[PDB]
Enzyme design. Structure first.
Site, PDB file in Angstrom:
ATOM      1  N   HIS A   1       6.906  -7.831  -4.529  1.00  0.00           N
ATOM      2  CA  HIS A   1       6.315  -6.875  -5.328  1.00  0.00           C
ATOM      3  C   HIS A   1       5.008  -7.582  -6.120  1.00  0.00           C
ATOM      4  O   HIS A   1       3.944  -6.771  -6.458  1.00  0.00           O
ATOM      5  CB  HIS A   1       7.216  -6.206  -6.274  1.00  0.00           C
ATOM      6  CG  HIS A   1       7.907  -5.098  -5.447  1.00  0.00           C
ATOM      7  ND1 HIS A   1       7.125  -4.009  -4.836  1.00  0.00           N
ATOM      8  CD2 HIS A   1       9.344  -5.302  -4.844  1.00  0.00           C
ATOM      9  CE1 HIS A   1       7.882  -3.353  -4.497  1.00  0.00           C
ATOM     10  NE2 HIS A   1       9.323  -3.952  -4.036  1.00  0.00           N
TER      11      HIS A   1
ATOM     12  N   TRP B   1       9.688  -0.308 -10.211  1.00  0.00           N
ATOM     13  CA  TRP B   1      10.282  -0.561  -8.951  1.00  0.00           C
ATOM     14  C   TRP B   1      11.659  -0.223  -8.876  1.00  0.00           C
ATOM     15  O   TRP B   1      12.141   0.218  -7.861  1.00  0.00           O
ATOM     16  CB  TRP B   1       9.656  -1.493  -8.005  1.00  0.00           C
ATOM     17  CG  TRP B   1       8.345  -1.268  -7.548  1.00  0.00           C
ATOM     18  CD1 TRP B   1       7.070  -1.432  -8.136  1.00  0.00           C
ATOM     19  CD2 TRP B   1       8.185  -0.625  -6.145  1.00  0.00           C
ATOM     20  NE1 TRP B   1       6.211  -0.995  -7.200  1.00  0.00           N
ATOM     21  CE2 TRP B   1       6.767  -0.432  -6.121  1.00  0.00           C
ATOM     22  CE3 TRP B   1       8.932  -0.146  -5.028  1.00  0.00           C
ATOM     23  CZ2 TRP B   1       6.272  -0.095  -4.651  1.00  0.00           C
ATOM     24  CZ3 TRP B   1       8.431   0.167  -4.009  1.00  0.00           C
ATOM     25  CH2 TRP B   1       7.185   0.218  -3.897  1.00  0.00           C
TER      26      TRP B   1
ATOM     27  N   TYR C   1       5.898  -6.742   7.955  1.00  0.00           N
ATOM     28  CA  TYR C   1       4.340  -6.768   7.742  1.00  0.00           C
ATOM     29  C   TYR C   1       3.620  -8.108   8.317  1.00  0.00           C
ATOM     30  O   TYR C   1       2.623  -8.583   7.663  1.00  0.00           O
ATOM     31  CB  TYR C   1       3.773  -6.413   6.237  1.00  0.00           C
ATOM     32  CG  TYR C   1       3.782  -5.049   5.840  1.00  0.00           C
ATOM     33  CD1 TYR C   1       5.112  -4.493   5.610  1.00  0.00           C
ATOM     34  CD2 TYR C   1       2.876  -4.258   5.772  1.00  0.00           C
ATOM     35  CE1 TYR C   1       5.069  -3.159   5.023  1.00  0.00           C
ATOM     36  CE2 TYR C   1       2.745  -3.029   5.478  1.00  0.00           C
ATOM     37  CZ  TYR C   1       3.930  -2.448   4.942  1.00  0.00           C
ATOM     38  OH  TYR C   1       4.135  -1.094   4.721  1.00  0.00           O
TER      39      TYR C   1
ATOM     40  N   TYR D   1      -5.112   0.902   9.727  1.00  0.00           N
ATOM     41  CA  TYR D   1      -4.472   0.946   8.413  1.00  0.00           C
ATOM     42  C   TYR D   1      -4.601  -0.160   7.718  1.00  0.00           C
ATOM     43  O   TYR D   1      -4.810  -0.316   6.560  1.00  0.00           O
ATOM     44  CB  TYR D   1      -3.034   1.796   8.605  1.00  0.00           C
ATOM     45  CG  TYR D   1      -2.579   1.872   6.991  1.00  0.00           C
ATOM     46  CD1 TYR D   1      -3.119   2.979   6.478  1.00  0.00           C
ATOM     47  CD2 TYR D   1      -1.705   1.000   6.381  1.00  0.00           C
ATOM     48  CE1 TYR D   1      -2.931   3.264   5.037  1.00  0.00           C
ATOM     49  CE2 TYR D   1      -1.311   1.364   4.975  1.00  0.00           C
ATOM     50  CZ  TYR D   1      -1.780   2.358   4.298  1.00  0.00           C
ATOM     51  OH  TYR D   1      -1.748   2.634   3.206  1.00  0.00           O
TER      52      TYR D   1
ATOM     53  N   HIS E   1      10.765   0.474   5.693  1.00  0.00           N
ATOM     54  CA  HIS E   1      10.295   0.669   4.287  1.00  0.00           C
ATOM     55  C   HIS E   1      11.243   0.496   3.174  1.00  0.00           C
ATOM     56  O   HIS E   1      11.246   0.074   2.161  1.00  0.00           O
ATOM     57  CB  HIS E   1       9.328   1.635   3.945  1.00  0.00           C
ATOM     58  CG  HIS E   1       8.050   1.406   4.459  1.00  0.00           C
ATOM     59  ND1 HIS E   1       6.970   2.666   4.682  1.00  0.00           N
ATOM     60  CD2 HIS E   1       7.300   0.252   4.640  1.00  0.00           C
ATOM     61  CE1 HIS E   1       5.955   1.836   4.943  1.00  0.00           C
ATOM     62  NE2 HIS E   1       5.918   0.460   4.931  1.00  0.00           N
TER      63      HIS E   1
END
Length: 186
Positions: A18, A88, A181, A129, A166
């Site tokens: 994060h 989060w 990713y 994207y 995710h």
């Protein structure tokens, strides 16, 4: 694979994931971000470049708004990383309760909106994207995503699978989600 449901919020790897994202969003390097900026990135930048319809843009906006409000963001509210990360933790908890209840999560609904602009996306769509959002501008990283995920019969990615991934990537630091990713996001 059973998605990892247990959180791991003190793991330095989850923090770093994060932190990487925060600092990516903090384009001006001043340590704070706002919902305004996030929604502008969503709507004025990403959806415009993806040539989303007005309705698709609006739907995506609503989803981004709900998602980031879930991590404590708000228009005009300047959030620094520690508060963002606290947000989060709250988002992840709330999402996991929805997951347990078989209620669509905010990350799923965001995915629905993204996928609709493109329930499957192709590698070439994901590469676009990655560049347009900037989360994964290396096409090799995007290839890694597709290698990593369980794909459909055409080699395309479904939103159910991406959502599973995710949950593990953004919320629970699931080892099964590592590398989602590629090297684009740690």
């Amino acid at each position: 694979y059973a998605v990892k449901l247990k959180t791991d919020f003190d793991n330095p790897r989850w923090i770093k994931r994060h932190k990487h994202m925060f600092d990516f969003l903090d384009i001006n390097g001043n340590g704070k971000i706002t919902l305004d900026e996030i929604v502008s990135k969503a709507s004025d930048d990403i959806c415009a470049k993806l040539e989303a319809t007005p309705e698709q843009t609006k739907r995506h906006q609503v989803c981004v708004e709900a998602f980031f409000r879930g991590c404590g963001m708000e228009y005009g509210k300047e959030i620094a990383f520690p508060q963002f990360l606290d947000g989060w933790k709250q988002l992840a908890t709330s999402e996991l309760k929805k997951w347990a209840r078989n209620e669509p999560t905010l990350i799923r609904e965001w995915g629905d909106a993204v996928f609709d602009i493109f329930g499957t996306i192709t590698l070439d769509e994901w590469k676009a994207y990655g560049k347009i959002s900037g989360i994964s501008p290396s096409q090799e990283d995007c290839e890694a995503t597709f290698r990593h995920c369980d794909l459909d019969n055409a080699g395309d990615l479904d939103v159910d699978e991406m959502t599973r991934q995710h949950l593990g990537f953004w919320y629970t630091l699931d080892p099964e989600a590592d590398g989602l990713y590629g090297n684009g996001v740690p």
